[PDB]
Write a protein that holds these residues in place. Sequence first.
Motif, PDB file in Angstrom:
ATOM      1  N   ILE C 155       0.817  -1.211   0.000  1.00 33.87           N
ATOM      2  CA  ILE C 155       0.000   0.000   0.000  1.00 33.87           C
ATOM      3  C   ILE C 155       0.855   1.268   0.000  1.00 33.87           C
ATOM      4  O   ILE C 155       2.040   1.254   0.391  1.00 33.87           O
ATOM      5  CB  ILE C 155      -0.983   0.051   1.204  1.00 33.87           C
ATOM      6  N   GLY C 156       0.225   2.361  -0.422  1.00 31.52           N
ATOM      7  CA  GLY C 156       0.834   3.681  -0.408  1.00 31.52           C
ATOM      8  C   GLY C 156      -0.045   4.752   0.240  1.00 31.52           C
ATOM      9  O   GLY C 156      -1.241   4.840  -0.048  1.00 31.52           O
ATOM     10  N   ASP C 157       0.540   5.547   1.136  1.00 32.70           N
ATOM     11  CA  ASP C 157      -0.163   6.659   1.773  1.00 32.70           C
ATOM     12  C   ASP C 157       0.397   8.027   1.368  1.00 32.70           C
ATOM     13  O   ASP C 157       1.601   8.276   1.473  1.00 32.70           O
ATOM     14  CB  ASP C 157      -0.117   6.539   3.301  1.00 32.70           C
ATOM     15  N   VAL C 158      -0.488   8.894   0.889  1.00 29.82           N
ATOM     16  CA  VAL C 158      -0.176  10.304   0.639  1.00 29.82           C
ATOM     17  C   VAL C 158      -0.636  11.206   1.794  1.00 29.82           C
ATOM     18  O   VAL C 158      -1.770  11.089   2.273  1.00 29.82           O
ATOM     19  CB  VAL C 158      -0.817  10.773  -0.687  1.00 29.82           C
ATOM     20  N   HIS C 159       0.246  12.101   2.234  1.00 31.54           N
ATOM     21  CA  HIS C 159      -0.067  13.041   3.321  1.00 31.54           C
ATOM     22  C   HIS C 159      -0.098  14.512   2.851  1.00 31.54           C
ATOM     23  O   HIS C 159       0.732  14.926   2.034  1.00 31.54           O
ATOM     24  CB  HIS C 159       0.947  12.877   4.451  1.00 31.54           C
ATOM     25  N   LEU C 160      -1.057  15.288   3.371  1.00 29.41           N
ATOM     26  CA  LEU C 160      -1.161  16.731   3.065  1.00 29.41           C
ATOM     27  C   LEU C 160      -1.226  17.628   4.303  1.00 29.41           C
ATOM     28  O   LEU C 160      -1.934  17.291   5.262  1.00 29.41           O
ATOM     29  CB  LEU C 160      -2.417  17.034   2.256  1.00 29.41           C
ATOM     30  N   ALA C 161      -0.528  18.773   4.282  1.00 25.25           N
ATOM     31  CA  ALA C 161      -0.675  19.767   5.378  1.00 25.25           C
ATOM     32  C   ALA C 161      -0.349  21.224   4.973  1.00 25.25           C
ATOM     33  O   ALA C 161       0.529  21.436   4.140  1.00 25.25           O
ATOM     34  CB  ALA C 161       0.197  19.366   6.550  1.00 25.25           C
ATOM     35  N   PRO C 162      -1.041  22.228   5.571  1.00 25.03           N
ATOM     36  CA  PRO C 162      -0.813  23.670   5.305  1.00 25.03           C
ATOM     37  C   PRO C 162       0.447  24.299   5.947  1.00 25.03           C
ATOM     38  O   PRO C 162       0.767  23.956   7.085  1.00 25.03           O
ATOM     39  CB  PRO C 162      -2.069  24.326   5.896  1.00 25.03           C
ATOM     40  N   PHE C 163       1.127  25.223   5.259  1.00 26.11           N
ATOM     41  CA  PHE C 163       2.352  25.831   5.831  1.00 26.11           C
ATOM     42  C   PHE C 163       2.465  27.361   5.716  1.00 26.11           C
ATOM     43  O   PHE C 163       1.826  27.979   4.859  1.00 26.11           O
ATOM     44  CB  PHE C 163       3.593  25.220   5.163  1.00 26.11           C
ATOM     45  N   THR C 164       3.325  27.946   6.561  1.00 28.74           N
ATOM     46  CA  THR C 164       3.706  29.365   6.467  1.00 28.74           C
ATOM     47  C   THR C 164       5.215  29.560   6.186  1.00 28.74           C
ATOM     48  O   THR C 164       6.058  29.010   6.896  1.00 28.74           O
ATOM     49  CB  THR C 164       3.329  30.139   7.772  1.00 28.74           C
ATOM     50  N   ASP C 165       5.536  30.341   5.149  1.00 25.26           N
ATOM     51  CA  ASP C 165       6.927  30.683   4.800  1.00 25.26           C
ATOM     52  C   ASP C 165       7.044  31.928   3.910  1.00 25.26           C
ATOM     53  O   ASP C 165       7.109  31.819   2.686  1.00 25.26           O
ATOM     54  CB  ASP C 165       7.608  29.501   4.093  1.00 25.26           C
ATOM     55  N   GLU C 166       7.090  33.102   4.530  1.00 14.91           N
ATOM     56  CA  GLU C 166       7.154  34.372   3.803  1.00 14.91           C
ATOM     57  C   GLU C 166       8.368  34.559   2.882  1.00 14.91           C
ATOM     58  O   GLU C 166       8.234  35.133   1.794  1.00 14.91           O
ATOM     59  CB  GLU C 166       7.072  35.523   4.803  1.00 14.91           C
TER      60      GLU C 166
END
Lengths: 343, 343, 342, 342
Positions: C155-166
């Motif tokens: 099996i394969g798992d894809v992960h997503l998350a929001p970020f801050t970097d000005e």
Amino acid sequence: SVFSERTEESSAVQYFQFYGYLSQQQNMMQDYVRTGTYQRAILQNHTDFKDKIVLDVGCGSGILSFFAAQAGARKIYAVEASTMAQHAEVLVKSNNLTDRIVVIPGKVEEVSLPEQVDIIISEPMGYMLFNERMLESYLHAKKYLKPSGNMFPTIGDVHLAPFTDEQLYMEQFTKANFWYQPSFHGVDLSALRGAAVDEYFRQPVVDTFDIRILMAKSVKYTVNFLEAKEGDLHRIEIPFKFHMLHSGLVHGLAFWFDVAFIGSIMTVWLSTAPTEPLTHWYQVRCLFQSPLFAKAGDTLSGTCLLIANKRQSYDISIVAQVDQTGSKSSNLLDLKNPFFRYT
Amino acid sequence: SVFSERTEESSAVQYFQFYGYLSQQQNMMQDYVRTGTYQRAILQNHTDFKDKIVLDVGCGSGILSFFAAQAGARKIYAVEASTMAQHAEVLVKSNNLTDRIVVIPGKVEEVSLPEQVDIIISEPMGYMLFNERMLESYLHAKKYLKPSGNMFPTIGDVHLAPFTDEQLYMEQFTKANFWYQPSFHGVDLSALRGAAVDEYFRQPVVDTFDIRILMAKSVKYTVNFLEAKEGDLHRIEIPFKFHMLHSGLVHGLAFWFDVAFIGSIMTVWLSTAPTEPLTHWYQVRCLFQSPLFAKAGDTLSGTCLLIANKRQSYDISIVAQVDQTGSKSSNLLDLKNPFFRYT
Amino acid sequence: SVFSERTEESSAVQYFQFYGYLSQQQNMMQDYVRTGTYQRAILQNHTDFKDKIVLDVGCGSGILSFFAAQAGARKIYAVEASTMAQHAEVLVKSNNLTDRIVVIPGKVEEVSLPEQVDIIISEPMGYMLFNERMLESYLHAKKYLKPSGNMFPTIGDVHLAPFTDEQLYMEQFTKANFWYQPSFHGVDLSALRGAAVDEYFRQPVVDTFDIRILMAKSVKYTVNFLEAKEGDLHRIEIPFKFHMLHSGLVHGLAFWFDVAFIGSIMTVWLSTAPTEPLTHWYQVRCLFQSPLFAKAGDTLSGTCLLIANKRQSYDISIVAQVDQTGSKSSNLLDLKNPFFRY
Amino acid sequence: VFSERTEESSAVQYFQFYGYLSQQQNMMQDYVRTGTYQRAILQNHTDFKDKIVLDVGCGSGILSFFAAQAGARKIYAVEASTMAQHAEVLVKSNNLTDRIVVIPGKVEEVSLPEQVDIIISEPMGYMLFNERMLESYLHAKKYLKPSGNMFPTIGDVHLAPFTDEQLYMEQFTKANFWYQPSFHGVDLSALRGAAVDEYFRQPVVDTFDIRILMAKSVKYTVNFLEAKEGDLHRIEIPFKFHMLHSGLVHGLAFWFDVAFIGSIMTVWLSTAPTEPLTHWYQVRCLFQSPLFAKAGDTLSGTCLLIANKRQSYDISIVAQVDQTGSKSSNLLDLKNPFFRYT
Ligand SMILES: Nc1ncnc2c1ncn2[C@@H]1O[C@H](CN(CC[C@H](N)C(=O)O)CC(=O)CBr)[C@@H](O)[C@H]1O
Ligand SMILES: Nc1ncnc2c1ncn2[C@@H]1O[C@H](CN(CC[C@H](N)C(=O)O)CC(=O)CBr)[C@@H](O)[C@H]1O
Ligand SMILES: Nc1ncnc2c1ncn2[C@@H]1O[C@H](CSCC[C@H]([NH3+])C(=O)O)[C@@H](O)[C@H]1O
Ligand SMILES: Nc1ncnc2c1ncn2[C@@H]1O[C@H](CSCC[C@H]([NH3+])C(=O)O)[C@@H](O)[C@H]1O
């Protein structure tokens, strides 16, 4: 009167009310370079004051009239338009100088004096020298000066030089980018993006800086207060041609000024240059909306034009080009609304 | 007009020039507490807006009208007197809302509307709620509201409480004592010290503070915007009786305020109390000329009187006494010229 | 064939030409996390290979087949389409394994095999897991798998998350501003500023970062290789709802992936997360042209849509909103042309 | 003529590359290049005033504007990549639609309505000839009047011998990766020889200190007014070096100059290592075995350049020390260079 013809009432009210507060006098008096240099200039040329008649234009608290009294002046007329005039009278009495210093409330363009004078003193310099338009009041007063009289200060030098500074430029650009948003709480603001950049970049930047940001030796513009006429200051045109000493991006132009007191015994100088100790005038910088690239050895030529307006200040137009490539920049500044960046 | 009749021209010019700058709108829009609570209040009472006629008093950029458009309003009249009005028109067009929002340049007391409305919205609160006197313009607009119409916000509460802060009190003398010296460059300044002290104490202090400085539960004064008339805000009298919870010296009075949106579905509150997250209004403190000692269990009684003035602001009169002792103090302050202390 | 139908010849030529260089194989072999985890996965589950028939899809240098031989496999069919195939045979002979490893040159969609297999092995993961579209070939191969057979990875798992970097945002914003000049050697360039911004922001950023830039717990999307069909990977739609843990500006979305080897003896995981040791895949970030403000406690919801294209990559569409406020952002990216920032 | 001599797969990638605004941007920021073109055009104003001009491969259009500043009467601007849509935008916004006309397509296939007084272009690649665009430049002379001029007018390629022990040594350090008996249990050594061979076939792109040069350069001159296209299919460069210094020779270094010959003055553009760096850098080609030479000796031989169908050249080098008879050679593929610059 000559003053009222060129000034918005609304501006003048606010202007003279501002100077009615004791806290601003305190703030001004505590600039030691200023106060000390004026006292040095007056006392070291004491023979220009001994047994003479004097006029002090815009005396405020009265400090300069006191210096003239110390050097042996026989009579001093002290003119002041704000309510500070009432506080000045208190100090004249508590210092026992009623026989020598005479406070005359009102504008110099409007009052009547009893006799002609030998010498005029004043502190009329603003940001970039010319802000607040008080220099015009200083020259007008020459209607009271004898054919062989003197003026303290006698001349003024304005200095200009090109600079590089990325960090300042990005800081101002970042503020403008707020108006770029397509969905602020569901609302599209972007149509105003252009208007916001223009507004921010019209603000002159007041602060100090390291001299290593300068990219060429400065250019000088001199005004002689003994010779000049009031009318000369409604339109001021300053041409320039720089020989570039370093390669890089030019982000704008830096400004400062010197004045000289030319007495019978010696000449004394007061300077606001970035090589000298800091004063409350600091220095002034004008940014281009887009920077100019230049190599060492190139020439940078153009013009700085100042046109006076009715809010007691100037509209500034700056145009510059690199002669070898034709890269050209133009910009407009509103000296009335500066950005105070210091600390 | 009713407006020009209560405002000197000089003041009005600077007032409306100030609000013509985009940076100033940007500053207000970026206060999340302020902007978010309005949106929640309008959207969660959607039955008060769907297919209704709405009036927006002093729209600035226009944001509140857009919130009303989101809630399903049929028609919105947006009135604005500064040049920001020209920019608001640009945003309505780019957001496809010309069929529902109509921008009207001018004073709300002088323009003409074609029809009656079901509900009024506005953001007219200043320092201490009442500063800048825009609340009089909000009530004036009720000439356009249908019988049994509604107001958002619906009521306003101003809160008062006694405080202790030794350092703040001590700061004023430290500043004024600059003038207490016999030879500043040879000049004796001491005669002006008393005047300098007075000037500092007439300024209300703007900043925030730890709630543990409060010495008793607050007293509340309420304005109902559905019932009040304009004339009611020219003279505001607030009596008080505090039951002291802690022993100590009282140095003065602290102020803050709340407003409430009372809809058909629910009531929503916006608060600037020191127990809540900071906003751009901060809080306001007014000092007594001399502090008062009170022990826990004593009662502190007196009155706060607010009188409108010609610079679009208020003169503040405060009188206070400790009932068990007869110890008494007063102060009179000018809200037009506050001291911004926040760091 | 199925491969040629979904791929421009021009792209594929350069693609298989690229993998014909020994220097690139040297680069791939030297990723120690990669090479070590595979060997561990195969050898610790040696009973799933012992006396079995095996298929290796896209063998390259041949490295995985040697691992399969070490675990006791009876027969291994090794398929490879690039010229690296000529070099793999050289290694098979010099290591005396001609009786156990059989090299078959060509595409897996086109060759003929002599028999069905018990288990399939491959390394088909690209940037963001899906780049290069090799995963379709891995599933296609199940036509050769016995009914109760297995797949490594499983099996394969894809992960997503929001970020801050000005700084990254301003870095990309700075480059585009060249086209803002009103007088470059006397020429007005400004009319193209809009075209320049769009071009720059369509580039995904490949590099690594400090985990403290993340603003919420990740969302997970799982692909099961035992059940999935090839067609399932043509259009991939991933919905998300984040509960914000921190207040601030969201500048974009960060992506990474895990794969799992589920054997009879134990399960072994291979991960490219920013909390784990760096691999040659690094991480991938997608910027918004304009950032979104959010508060702690708010919810950020939307969908990420992936469309396969003929240059062996994907067209990326991302749409997002802060539910409590109605603030929205939308953007389009081209995974084929990344910006290498490291 | 273009389509017969270039494989399509190559042409696609080639014109795709130049369709990016960022690459134009990259070329425009090289001040030496742009400034020297501008100076050459403006200081020879009598060569442009009231004339008809052709711009071959205009890209963003920057050179046609210079032609416009000098007073040209009419300018035809030809461009085959999609940059053509953007060039049209700039012509309109600079109010020059009455004088500049943008023509999308290849110069070998488009039609021009009239003969011209002068041709301008920037077709130079690595070591001058790479990319094979000079043949298009010469092909355009079918539109040139008998008494017309070309800007640039001539091109000089320079050659000189160098010494660099560390560079020569680097190739084996990289190749010796394969010389090990148990990389995770596999013997890799059988592929070492092939690895070495692969590295030496790559020309090295970067710059260097001038003190590594061992003799005054040899010059080969092309006169663009006189030359024909066919002259560039086979380029034979003989050489005889008189050694100024004693030591080991590891290979040959390359650079080039171009000249603008006007009625008022001649202007030069140089990429020599004695001048400020440009985006062309320099190129070095190794011998397989170094040659020892003494000061005063002579080093003689040949460099032969053969054009190929991937829009590039195969490079053949042969060299000998006349006083000793010590001899060496190498054959290189310029299409796939090694970018070493640090
Ligand atoms: N036309 C006029 N007629 C009479 N008085 C005028 C006038 N224009 C300005 N003034 C008055 O001139 C004063 C200017 N400042 C006085 C400080 C005084 N020199 C000192 O050293 O204490 C110095 C200053 O502001 C320079 Br930064 C102010 O008090 C202002 O009210
Ligand atoms: N349809 C197909 N048929 C046959 N072979 C194919 C193929 N598609 C790709 N390949 C080939 O598979 C290889 C790519 N994989 C790595 C090689 C091998 N696993 C190793 O250990 O080095 C995986 C990888 O590179 C991920 Br970064 C390359 O050699 C490629 O040419
Ligand atoms: N009497 C008046 N008539 C019309 N506009 C006014 C009046 N008094 C104040 N204003 C404007 O009202 C605004 C108050 S500030 C609030 C701005 C806007 N409602 C927002 O929520 O962002 C300013 O832009 C003033 O210029
Ligand atoms: N045969 C051809 N026909 C038309 N344009 C071509 C041809 N071969 C190359 N080009 C273009 O020529 C350009 C070379 S780069 C020079 C670009 C620009 N004039 C400048 O100096 O800034 C690229 O944009 C190529 O796409």
